[PDB]
Design a protein around this ligand. Structure first.
Ligand code: A1EDZ
Ligand code: CL
Length: 147
């Protein structure tokens, strides 16, 4: 049937079927079609007051709530998916990670290096695919698999 990680779902507003990935939190209308030692990813991080280090190059003291951080992430995802904004542009401007200065690029990595939710989402993404919101101890991430 469906590839692992994917499940069929129903739009509440339209009744149209869609597909949801519970490892990446990605959702899409089309049926996903069915692992390497290493992947390369970029990401955009939004931190919140409960982040492991609630501070970034953008803000000495990060005070936003987790719910506020999720709303910002959701808004960035909308603009990326509509093409109004580029992932790399939003990461350079608004990512609370030091990788913002590199358009969010993390380089290549193996399993066992990254926090587990981030690692699992990165390796379940197809090349070129974007995640939905991914939660870690650092905050909330949008992940783009580039290689
Ligand atoms: O933070 C850690 O414990 C390991 C590195 C890690 O997971 C990430 C750093 C940038 C994106 S996710
Ligand atoms: Cl804010």
């Amino acid at each position: 049937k469906l590839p692992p990680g994917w499940e069929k779902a129903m739009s509440r507003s339209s009744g149209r079927v869609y597909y949801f990935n519970h490892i990446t939190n990605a959702s899409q209308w089309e049926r996903p079609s069915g692992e390497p030692a290493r992947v390369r990813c970029s990401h955009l991080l939004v931190k919140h007051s409960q982040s492991r280090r609630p501070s970034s190059w953008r803000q000495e003291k990060i005070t936003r709530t987790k719910e506020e951080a999720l709303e910002l992430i959701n808004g960035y995802i909308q603009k990326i998916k509509s093409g109004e904004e580029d992932f790399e542009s939003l990461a350079s401007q608004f990512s609370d990670c030091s990788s913002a200065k590199a358009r969010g690029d993390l380089g290549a990595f193996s399993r066992g290096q990254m926090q587990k939710p981030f690692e699992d989402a990165s390796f379940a993404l197809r090349t070129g695919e974007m995640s939905g919101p991914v939660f870690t101890d650092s905050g909330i991430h949008i992940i783009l698999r580039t290689e």
